Design a binder for these strands. Structure first.
Ligand SMILES: [Mg+2]
Ligand SMILES: [Mg+2]
Ligand SMILES: [Mg+2]
Ligand SMILES: [Mg+2]
Ligand SMILES: [Mg+2]
Ligand SMILES: [Mg+2]
Ligand SMILES: [Mg+2]
Ligand SMILES: [Mg+2]
Ligand SMILES: [Mg+2]
Ligand SMILES: [Mg+2]
Ligand SMILES: [Mg+2]
Ligand SMILES: [Mg+2]
Ligand SMILES: [Mg+2]
Ligand SMILES: [Mg+2]
Ligand SMILES: [Mg+2]
Ligand SMILES: [Mg+2]
Ligand SMILES: [Mg+2]
Ligand SMILES: [Mg+2]
Ligand SMILES: [Mg+2]
Ligand SMILES: [Mg+2]
Ligand SMILES: [Mg+2]
Ligand SMILES: [Mg+2]
Ligand SMILES: [Mg+2]
Ligand SMILES: [Mg+2]
Ligand SMILES: [Mg+2]
Ligand SMILES: [Mg+2]
Ligand SMILES: [Mg+2]
Ligand SMILES: [Mg+2]
Ligand SMILES: [Mg+2]
Ligand SMILES: [Mg+2]
Ligand SMILES: [Mg+2]
Ligand SMILES: [Mg+2]
Ligand SMILES: [Mg+2]
Ligand SMILES: [Mg+2]
Ligand SMILES: [Mg+2]
Ligand SMILES: [Mg+2]
Ligand SMILES: [Mg+2]
Ligand SMILES: [Mg+2]
Ligand SMILES: [Mg+2]
Ligand SMILES: [Mg+2]
Ligand SMILES: [Mg+2]
Ligand SMILES: [Mg+2]
Ligand SMILES: [Mg+2]
Ligand SMILES: [Mg+2]
Ligand SMILES: [Mg+2]
Ligand SMILES: [Mg+2]
Ligand SMILES: [Mg+2]
Ligand SMILES: [Mg+2]
Ligand SMILES: [Mg+2]
Ligand SMILES: [Mg+2]
Ligand SMILES: [Zn+2]
Lengths: 104, 99, 83, 208
RNA sequence: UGGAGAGUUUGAUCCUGGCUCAGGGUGAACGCUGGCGGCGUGCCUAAGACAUGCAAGUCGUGCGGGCCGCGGGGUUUUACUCCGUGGUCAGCGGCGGACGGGUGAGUAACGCGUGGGUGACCUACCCGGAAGAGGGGGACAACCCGGGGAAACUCGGGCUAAUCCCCCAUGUGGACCCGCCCCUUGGGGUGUGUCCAAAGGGCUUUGCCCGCUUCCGGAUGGGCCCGCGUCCCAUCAGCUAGUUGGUGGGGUAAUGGCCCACCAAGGCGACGACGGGUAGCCGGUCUGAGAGGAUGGCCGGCCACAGGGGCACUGAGACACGGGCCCCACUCCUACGGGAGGCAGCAGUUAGGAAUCUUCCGCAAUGGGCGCAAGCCUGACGGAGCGACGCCGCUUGGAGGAAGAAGCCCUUCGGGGUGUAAACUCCUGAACCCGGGACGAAACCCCCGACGAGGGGACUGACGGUACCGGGGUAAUAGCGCCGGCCAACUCCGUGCCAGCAGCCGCGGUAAUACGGAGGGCGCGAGCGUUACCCGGAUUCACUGGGCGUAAAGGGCGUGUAGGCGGCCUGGGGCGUCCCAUGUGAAAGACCACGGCUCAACCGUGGGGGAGCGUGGGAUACGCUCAGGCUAGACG
């Protein structure tokens, strides 16, 4: 079965491509506590049909480009930057904890 | 010394010089056909295209191209010619092309 | 070319073969595709040759190609008897 | 190879009386009858309370020297007994008791276990027909253990199976003094055996 | 069915805590010692360098020749020449040389593992099905002739065969463009146009065998892609410009920045990017009560490599260990112009090292390549050799034999011990001798039969004259460590903080169970002990299973980002979680049973279990999520 995944479009800054942030939980192999963990897939969007904030499903596909191996299957729930927001802030903290520092 | 399957390298060289040639004809004629379709010269362009098709299918006859390779060639050729001719605003004057 | 042959499995001076289906290119004792019988050359026990002709008949039906000895045993097991 | 060397001294050290010989370890001789104390210079001085180790040590030594088997073999057997279903203690005794040499000793073909060993070694003993000469061979229930046709005329075997006329045999065995045959009926149980051994201690000795 | 702890901080105590020991393990090495057999195992260092032999070929049923020879013809003789046949040699052509064998350098990566995807693909030989092979043309070796080179080797001219190459036809069919239909990434169908087939050979010769062509299907093997998993250092924090995506094109069997041109300005990172270090990954293995830790050697699977670096050719498949080209290093030959090599194949040499074997036998068996077959090749393989290197099995004897020899040792001088030990008697009888002597081998092949099914016949073993069987037959190897506590085993003498011991505590400066010897003793035994390394004890990195007032350990305080965690009631979803069924979880190994070798080791057959992941179905208490409500937290 071609793998199907669900994540949030955290980037529509490309031509016919969207970055989908897929999240997944699971027990820690030794400590058992359930831990969240995520990943970004560059899904193909031929019709630039998906916008920043959409919760789409990604489908395993025949390679489209290096890095692109998934296609946007269908939209699950439109708009919701509450999720995108998280992502961006996590990003913002980066440029900080290097040579000088971040925020609070 | 001397492992007589030196014959193999002997043969390989001849086989090489053999494919080497067939592929050149192919390339050349293809260009020729393409170049003409470009010019808009209907008849002649197509005519040449047939030789091209022929040599290609023929190269695939032995082991100089075989199957897909040849199929890929033919498509890309008929592809370009069709387009170039249509663009040139030229009516396909017989020979080749299932128009 | 897939074949039906014998694979060494006994031990020094105590040979025991597994009638097997495998690609001709495999080691003789490497990964086979399917075991379809066994054979004890020295008949150390009453049951020194089992064959499961059902399966043999299948592999043969798909291009399996027995070794001259593998066939001898397959035959003995009635794999070819048509009657 | 097996021990060899003064035996009626192990008896002394082990305290208990081991029967590592025949006729004599019954005569008023087997040292335990004369000087029932360990060998060597200090054999008679007072003995200090033995350590838990010493206790477990000796117990094993005893049980083991009875069947005059090496530590290697003795240990392996133990590990097997340990791995099977059922009380290790009993099982272990059962396996030791299933050694061919022992069974031959049990049937009276031999005066002592050592003698039994040599009988088996010199092919004087047979198991279900085929002759076996492995003192370590494991007799299973059902096996008939006879004396070699060829050997049935050996003075010693005559003398022995003669004295056997009358003598009873373990409830897990059956002897046919007649044709010099014997049969292994079943694995003896701990209740069947009367060894001066505390198997619980031996099991513990290997716990450490 | 599974879990032991001890010594050592003190004058003593309790705690904390490190150190140390008893156990198991090994591709071992070293010391002393060493009798047999079976099975297994044996360069861990220089992926250093390698003499010599061997290690991949095979087809005369694809083709034409050269050389040596025999026979028969056309010849009155001669010259000249035709046919048949033996041997031999390459050459052309074909299939194999991409397997098998080796190694682990590199690689932290879709490399490997596990589960999936391929409407994005390939597959020689093999199997099933459908259809087909008509006509014509050419060339290059061999061979002949001439040239150049020291050699390796090469150049020119002439002739010639084929299942070598090409052209025309036939088009079952198939390929491409375009259209339409059904399907849904490039799947399947259909119409017009164009395009593409083939080779023959053998005969028990009008038939049968071997082969050839196009096409569909199968089978096997394989490419590519994806989820999850895969060591250390953050005293490595920012990395990236083919770099991220797009459009068109190239390239491939095929997707893809794989490559290119243009365009856009992106992509990755603390869930640790980038960088450094280390390392082939796995089934497994060792240890452990388990969880875990350590490991990847034999064997099996995958990857990578073939003196170092790069490259492509030929092919179904190679970027090709025993093929090619170039550059580099090193070695060898040279008339200095130029040539030749690559044992990480088998055996062997040499170097390094604490340390790792025979230049063995055989192709009989199993497996492989070529062949119609006979058969040929096979250092793959089956065996044998050497090494207690490991494991299992076995011997150096058995019974009797004194209130007790001798010697040695101790003594309270009475005696005690070594000791039934010996001597000695009887008994058996490993070695060794003699005789017999094998399974592993029945196929290919021949004959009958239809070259089928089936039936009959013939050839063939390195191991080996070995195993095993029978007769005869000799009492016939024992060593090593230890004895203060941990820890089983004590005395005398010598020595005098010396000489020495030592794993830890410690022992030795004249009464030492601790040093050396002796007597005695304990442990194990063809072994015993040491050194090294892994796990254990160590709940001493604590998930199971620890801690931080004074023992090591609370951040100098706050504000607060990410993140972790979240009160009560209802409803929806069903992601976590739980359940059932199903696929997968190779073999080997592990567990159990039965069985083969006299046992066992070792091995055969069968059975059982098995985490994780895929798919289908179900449950909804708790965690989650969405929607609604509450006021006990919080805030006002
Ligand atoms: Mg050839
Ligand atoms: Mg038990
Ligand atoms: Mg003190
Ligand atoms: Mg104390
Ligand atoms: Mg302590
Ligand atoms: Mg000739
Ligand atoms: Mg080939
Ligand atoms: Mg690295
Ligand atoms: Mg990966
Ligand atoms: Mg081929
Ligand atoms: Mg010429
Ligand atoms: Mg041809
Ligand atoms: Mg048709
Ligand atoms: Mg044609
Ligand atoms: Mg790129
Ligand atoms: Mg992440
Ligand atoms: Mg390495
Ligand atoms: Mg533990
Ligand atoms: Mg756990
Ligand atoms: Mg190829
Ligand atoms: Mg090839
Ligand atoms: Mg080829
Ligand atoms: Mg090919
Ligand atoms: Mg080739
Ligand atoms: Mg090929
Ligand atoms: Mg080929
Ligand atoms: Mg080929
Ligand atoms: Mg090619
Ligand atoms: Mg081919
Ligand atoms: Mg090669
Ligand atoms: Mg080589
Ligand atoms: Mg052979
Ligand atoms: Mg063969
Ligand atoms: Mg005696
Ligand atoms: Mg003690
Ligand atoms: Mg001195
Ligand atoms: Mg003194
Ligand atoms: Mg000491
Ligand atoms: Mg001393
Ligand atoms: Mg032994
Ligand atoms: Mg631990
Ligand atoms: Mg804890
Ligand atoms: Mg602590
Ligand atoms: Mg403190
Ligand atoms: Mg504070
Ligand atoms: Mg917060
Ligand atoms: Mg809650
Ligand atoms: Mg669920
Ligand atoms: Mg399952
Ligand atoms: Mg048995
Ligand atoms: Zn006694």
């Amino acid at each position: 079965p071609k793998k199907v995944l669900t994540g949030v479009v955290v980037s529509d800054k490309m031509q016919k491509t969207v970055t989908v942030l897929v999240e997944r939980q699971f027990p820690h192999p030794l400590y058992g506590k359930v831990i969240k963990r995520s990943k970004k897939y560059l899904a193909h969007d031929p019709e630039e049909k998906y916008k920043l904030g959409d919760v789409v499903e990604i489908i395993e596909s025949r390679p489209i480009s290096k890095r692109k191996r998934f296609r946007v299957l269908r939209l699950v729930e439109s708009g919701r930057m509450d999720l995108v927001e998280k992502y961006l802030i996590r990003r913002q903290n980066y440029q900080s904890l290097s040579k000088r520092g971040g925020k609070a | 010394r001397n492992l007589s399957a030196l014959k193999r390298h002997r043969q390989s060289l001849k086989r090489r010089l053999r494919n080497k040639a067939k592929k050149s004809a192919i390339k050349t004629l293809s260009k020729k056909a393409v170049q003409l379709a470009q010019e808009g010269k209907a008849e002649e362009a197509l005519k040449i295209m047939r030789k091209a098709e022929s040599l290609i299918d023929k190269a695939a006859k032995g082991s100089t191209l075989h199957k897909n390779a040849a199929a890929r060639r033919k498509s890309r050729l008929m592809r370009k010619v069709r387009q170039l001719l249509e663009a040139a605003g030229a009516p396909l004057i017989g020979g080749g092309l299932s128009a | 070319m897939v074949k039906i042959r014998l694979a060494r499995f006994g031990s020094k001076h105590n040979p025991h073969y597994r009638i097997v289906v495998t690609d001709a290119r495999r080691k003789r004792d490497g990964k086979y595709i399917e075991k379809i019988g066994y054979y004890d050359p020295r008949k150390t026990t009453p049951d020194w040759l089992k064959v499961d002709v059902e399966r043999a008949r299948y592999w043969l039906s798909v291009g399996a190609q027995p070794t001259d000895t593998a066939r001898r045993l397959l035959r003995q097991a009635g794999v070819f008897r048509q009657e | 190879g097996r021990y060899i060397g003064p035996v009626c001294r192990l008896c002394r050290r082990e305290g208990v009386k081991l029967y590592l010989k025949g006729e004599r370890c019954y005569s008023p001789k087997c040292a335990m009858e004369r000087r029932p104390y360990p060998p060597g210079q200090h054999g008679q001085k007072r003995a200090r309370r033995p350590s838990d180790y010493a206790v477990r040590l000796r117990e094993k030594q005893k049980l083991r020297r009875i069947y005059g088997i090496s530590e290697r073999q003795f240990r392996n057997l133990f590990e097997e007994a340990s791995k099977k279903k059922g009380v290790t203690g009993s099982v272990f005794l059962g396996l030791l008791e299933s050694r061919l040499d022992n069974v031959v000793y049990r049937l009276g073909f031999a005066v002592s276990r050592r003698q039994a060993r040599q009988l088996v070694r010199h092919g004087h003993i047979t198991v279900n027909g085929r002759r076996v000469d492995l003192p370590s061979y494991r007799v299973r229930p059902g096996d008939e253990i006879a004396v070699a046709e060829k050997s049935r005329n050996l003075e010693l075997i005559r003398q022995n199976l003669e004295a056997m006329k009358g003598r009873k045999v373990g409830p897990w065995l059956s002897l046919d003094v007649e044709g010099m045959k014997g049969k292994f009926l079943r694995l003896p149980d701990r209740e069947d055996l009367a060894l001066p051994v505390q198997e619980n201690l031996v099991i513990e000795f290997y716990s450490r």
